[PDB]
Amino acid sequence: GSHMTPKDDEFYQQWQLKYPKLILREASSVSEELHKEVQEAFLTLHKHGCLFRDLVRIQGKDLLTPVSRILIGNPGCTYKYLNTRLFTVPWPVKGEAEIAAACETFLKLNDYLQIETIQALEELAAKEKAQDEVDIKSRAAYNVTLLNFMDPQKMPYLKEEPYFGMGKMAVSWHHDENLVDRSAVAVYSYSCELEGRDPDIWHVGFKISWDIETPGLAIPLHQGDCYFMLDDLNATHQHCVLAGSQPRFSSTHRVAECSTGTLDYILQRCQLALQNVCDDVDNDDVSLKSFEPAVLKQGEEIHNEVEFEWLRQFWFQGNRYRKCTDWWCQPMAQLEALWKKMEGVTNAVLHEVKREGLPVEQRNEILTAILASLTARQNLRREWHARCQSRIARTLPADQKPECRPYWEKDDASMPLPFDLTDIVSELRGQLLE
Template identity: 40%
Template sequence: GRHGVSLILRVHLLQRATRRKLLQELGDQKIPFLGPSDRGFQQLWDSSYSGLVLRRSCSLPAELHDQVQAALLTLRNKGCLLRDLVRVRDRDVFTAVSRVLLGEPGHTYRYLDTRLFAIPWHSEDSAVKGVNCCDPDLRAACRALWELNTFFCSDVSGLEEGDRLTQCVKVEVETRQGKEGDTESKHSEDSKNSEGGDSESRKSEEGDTESKHSEEWDIDSKHSEEGCPGSSQEGDWETESKHSSEEGECSQVKPSEGAILGQSEGKCPGWTSKPVSSTETETVALGAHGKPPGVQLQCGSLTGDHIDDKDDTGNVQGCSQPSPPQVCTGVVKFNVTLLNYMDPTAMSQLKEEPYYGMGKMAVGWHHDENLITHSPVAVYSYSCNDDKGDSGEGSSSSQKTCWRVGLKVAWDIHTPGLMLPLESGDCYYMKDDLNTTHQHCVLTGDNTRFSSTHRMAECSSGTLTYIQSRCQEALSNLHPDPETGSYSLLALLPTTLQHCEEIHNEVEFEWLRQYWFQGQRYARFCSWWTKPMEQLEKDWRLMETMTMLFLKTVEEGRAAEGRREMAETLLSALTDRHQQRQTWRDRCRSSLAQTLPPEEAPVDRPFWGVDDPNMPLPFDLADIINSVESLLWRM
């Protein structure tokens, strides 16, 4: 209601003022941040980022890696990963990363005014049920991500207070034949991070001309036509600061070296590397930054046996042969994963991280939205180096910048940021309220990179089952006359009618138009949503009939009592509908939308011409709104 709106507005203004104050205090300085090679990193992690847990690549089953990585490549090769044309504060922008949603059948995930519709992952029982909506390759890919999801559900459920990371020490293994070095990751309790890595100077990219796309999953991109990608979304200070034109705007920000503590971060690996010259692997237990033993995560199944890192064989259990993933316990049930993909060499307009000087961002600072409160997020990171015959993990990788995730405390310019380098196959978890109290961003490396971000989407109004039952609710007020084939409304109570009109708007704007705005992208790979969307459109058409009947009732003045209330209800529903139709028309016709190939181009659907005999009301509601308004004047 009106109260809610003014409250939101006030909070918004307050945030803006706070934001401004913090930025003033900060001035041109950069906030420090720490990476693994910086002293105090582990302490900072423990004290200010305790909800963050890293699971190193080595501690996942090799088979799972293979399946998941193959799946990600399949999804990319089939063209399933696409940049979203999202909306940020009334501006249309493309995300820098390409995405696709996988998840429980019928689930959706909403972010930045965009509802993504899940390609169902194919669990064991869906195979039994004969779900047959995509081709075998895609089905296998979806299944692999479901397996990963199952692993994460179990793994995250088993986390204990104080768990931070499963650590691996890189062990260089030289083959006798003198072939190129192979690197194997082994588990140990923790790593002592080598001090003083190379500092990396970054040239800020000037004068980009290649892309006209404004990018981001976020905020400030939208205030510059030239494309000003990256930054955060609602609810934090940086967001707005960059938005208001009097502050800074989105000029390229040069990292100011002096303030940056995390100077070696750009390089891979950010962690200790210990070369040995034999084919034997060696496990090295390194200092644990003062942490008592036993608080680190165990390899493999976290709920399994404790890892003995002094295993006689020199092998680390659970690392080379991790325990199989366990079935979801129900404690944590990720229902969707949002996959991200980016080839940084193809992106010319990436924005520098502006507050810490962390480097170029693929995803700007943000909180993940639309999640169950305080639910964890699990991320699998895969950086590959396609076509170049370089795995990105050999000795040459030390010259490469790796992908990193940046974290910051929201509304805080005093706590240093944290930068976590990710090697291919590494996973991290954001648990407890980390996503709420902190923001994160993704910093690009040299390689192409995928991530699979598993979430508990808040789906109370986000599943197909939900919207179908809403439609049934509305349609239960519509009575078909079997003899004449005409319809009538059963109840004429203003609250009933209002309820029906709300559902009408919900199915039209939250489902039909959201779906079609994303063009043919769903139907191209997977037919799962095709039939349900047709049915929803049929239901919606009946609701057009209901609105028409409602309008007639009001016009004919049959319900003398409460007529004014009915007219007001109708007017507000129609005004809302009219505005939202206009917004979707604009989104569909935006200059960015025009750049998309036909298969991906937004479709403004439902749309119909003025004289369409199948439609009870016109698409353009302006005239009807006027007539209801004047009717109200006359009452």
């Protein structure tokens, strides 16, 4: 197939018929007072070195993103994409000074794009007509924004768009992951400076999923243009970013699905796991109230959740968040402290199964409940330790080198359990034999 730009006559009627949920608001519809503030906050964060390339994993291989990113949003929120959890630099919601001011700026932009999204969603329902104001308000209540930056001149060879001849790509075809169902997405595009598409100007591409026969749209983006993906547009269509010649910033505001991705959620989950622990005093004499299989199953699953979805995800970035804010320092230290107690809980469970007065039928009730969690813990620890010690992981500079936290040697006597669980896991399976 091919692609369509405003240079083509059919481009405008294709937008009307098959992309009505895509809205474009040109820079002339936004106050200059806002343009100057947002564009200066972009350069303020870039000068302070607040945008970083992520070391994600796709299909078993570790990739460095061509785009530099920083997440800004509600305090305690997270956004997960490509197996990498991003932690928000907080913006002032009611209840390092130049950096704070930038976050206030993007909170102000968040309010504006929110009102614009609600109005565009109200016009869409009226056009389709000829309780739900709750759904419209929720699908527009952006909680985070993910800032992006790329200098196209820094890349030796940019990937070509492979289906419609759209030219060089900065971000390939994808859907935005981890969004509330049918939630909108607003993007502020800030570009720094005849056969088909102008390769010098940045574009955003659009196509139908599974469809390379239907020609896709290349929407040119100038300095200050905003486009909106409404309702199920993010699900039924893929989008990409077509690279220009000059660098470009972008602020993509989303309604992240954070039902299992807020600090409050994971702290409650930790408290629920420690309800099985005599919490009179904090020492190594960990005594568990119950040994009922489902309570122990729940305990070791929460143990895996805090370790892998939060601890190792956070320190895999390597204290680079400590350049912009210290908001997560105390929480990450509290979750690590809570995690250490759960290590002693696992040791207390391993102590009970090796007790002489426990009947075999009760022992096998506990092994069946916890083996799947201990298997996943050992398997995920090997992957994470391999991610931190990969060849591409060394080439990063020192202030964002992945730390395999938490990590300890067999020497370490402060830990009650080793890091390698292969001898334990294999034993519990052997205890299931006879």
